[PDB]
């Protein structure tokens, strides 16, 4: 059959009844860092059992009148385990993902959900003079949300969450040029997106830069009659994979 | 308008019981939650716990576990709390509030109160 | 068990000033939540999830603040907001409150 799957990385499985195919990045598996492309001249570490491992993020509930929801993928993991340790103690670190989104629902439920992976999403400001603060940009392992309505511009530091415009200043409808998947309720159950590392240089800092933003807006809201179950919820499994790190010092 | 109504205040005697209403119209009853507050007259606010109109499962606070009883009446879309053994200290007032499913979905928390009913224990 | 230590326990401002009112609590929580009570009616809600104003809250009010310390903000000091101020939790702990500082006008 093509609708069942099963991923295996470290100790962890998972396991679909009801999926599409997966969608590979931009055609290219993850994979470490060749000779020709290496600029550090140490030895780098790989746990590659420790860290490569699936860990789940925190579940949120799609209600009727919802936005949206987003989440900076060099952060999310931070303290999860391992992988936050060696972010720590570490200077440098490239990184590749597996994502896997998973929301059930009945046969008499509907629905549609827009699962993008957007590589270097610079968010917006809701007032024109300032830069959000990075408590609202991001947090660990919670979702920031977008809104239906506009943010007041008096505010001193927001990111603008108006979601037709994304936060970015863009047309939503034009966010599927990135790698994506839909779930949709009527024939669907998860997605599951794989995520090369995508970057302007062979390794980056893991704390000064996210640079990818995995975001899910319902393009058709969640709706039932009375008498279906009213709690939906929404988890987000996030595993590395082909992770290496350079540059031990102290812990910060 | 997303509108709850409660009903009206009354006096019971030391050792009694009363039992309170919060009628809620205007949204769809089934599809959220509803927790249920007190207010001391001099003091903050305290939780007592919530119940779930879809399948009936209460929760309660470790002071309030035993003397007040949550149920729900799905036909007429009100939510009713029992309260066991009145005492001296109870010249409150009880709130309730509708919330979203507590943590997995409570990111506008408690959005629509009530009046509120003050009772009193008194000879 | 989370505890809320909302602090001052009393704040005092002529009007037209900027001002400041903190709550800190013993962990990390999922979401909190600000409430504003005039002495003898409901509590109504203001501030949630940390910065979103609610429908008809005048722009002069603000919130911030993460990890273990959170702050309430107002900007000028209007005449029609001398109320006291609630703070509520909502992590896997069960629920908590703040205490009510309370804000008149000197």
């Known amino acids: 059959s093509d609708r069942v799957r099963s991923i295996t990385l470290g100790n962890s499985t998972i396991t679909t009844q009801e999926c599409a195919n997966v969608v590979v990045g931009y055609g290219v598996w993850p994979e470490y860092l060749k000779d020709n492309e290496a600029t550090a001249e140490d030895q780098p570490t790989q746990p590659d059992v420790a860290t490569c491992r699936f860990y789940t993020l925190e579940s949120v509930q799609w209600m009727k009148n919802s936005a949206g929801w987003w989440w900076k993928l060099p952060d999310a993991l931070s303290q999860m385990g391992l992988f936050g340790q060696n972010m720590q103690y570490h200077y440098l670190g490239r990184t590749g993902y597996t994502i896997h989104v998973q929301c059930n629902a009945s046969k008499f439920h509907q629905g549609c959900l827009l699962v993008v992976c957007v590589p270097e999403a610079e968010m917006g400001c809701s007032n024109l003079n300032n830069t959000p603060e990075f408590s609202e940009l991001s947090g660990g392992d919670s979702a920031r949300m977008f809104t239906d309505t506009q943010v007041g511009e008096s505010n001193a530091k927001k990111v603008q969450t108006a979601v037709w415009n994304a936060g970015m200043g863009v047309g939503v409808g034009n966010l599927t040029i990135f790698p994506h998947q839909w779930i949709n309720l009527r024939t669907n159950n998860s997605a599951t997106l794989v995520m090369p590392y995508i970057n302007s240089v062979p390794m980056d800092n893991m704390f000064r830069h996210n640079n990818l933003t995995l975001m899910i807006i319902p393009f058709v809201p969640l709706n039932y009659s009375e008498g279906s179950s009213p709690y939906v919820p929404i988890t987000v499994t996030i595993a590395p994979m082909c992770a290496e790190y350079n540059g031990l010092r102290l812990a910060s | 308008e997303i509108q709850l109504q409660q009903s009206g205040p009354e006096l019971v005697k030391p050792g009694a019981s009363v039992k309170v209403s919060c009628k809620a119209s205007?949204?769809?009853?089934?599809?959220?939650?509803i927790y249920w507050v007190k207010q001391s007259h001099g003091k903050s606010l305290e939780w007592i716990g919530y119940?779930?109109?879809?399948?009936?499962?209460?929760n309660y606070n470790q002071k309030f576990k035993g003397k007040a009883t949550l149920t729900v009446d799905k036909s007429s879309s009100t939510a009713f709390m029992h309260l066991n053994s009145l005492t001296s200290e109870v010249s409150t007032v009880y709130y309730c509030?509708?919330?979203?499913?507590?943590?997995?979905?409570?990111?506008?928390?408690?959005?629509?109160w009530g009046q509120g009913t003050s009772v009193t224990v008194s000879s | 068990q989370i505890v809320l230590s909302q602090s001052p326990a009393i704040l005092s401002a002529s009007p037209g000033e900027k001002v400041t009112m903190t709550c800190r609590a013993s962990?990390?929580?999922?979401?909190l939540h600000w409430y504003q009570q005039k002495p003898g009616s409901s509590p109504k809600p203001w501030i949630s999830?940390?910065?979103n104003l609610a429908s008809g809250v005048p722009a002069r009010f603000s919130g911030s603040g993460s990890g273990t310390s959170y702050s309430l903000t107002i900007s000028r000091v209007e005449a029609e907001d001398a109320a006291t101020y609630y703070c509520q939790q909502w992590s896997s702990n069960p629920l908590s409150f703040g205490g009510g500082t309370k804000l008149e006008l000197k």
């Open positions: 962990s990390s929580v999922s979401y």
């Open positions: 119940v779930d109109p879809y399948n009936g499962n209460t």
């Open positions: 205007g949204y769809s009853f089934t599809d959220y939650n």
């Open positions: 509030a509708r919330g979203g499913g507590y943590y997995g979905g409570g990111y506008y928390g408690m959005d629509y």
């Open positions: 999830a940390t910065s």
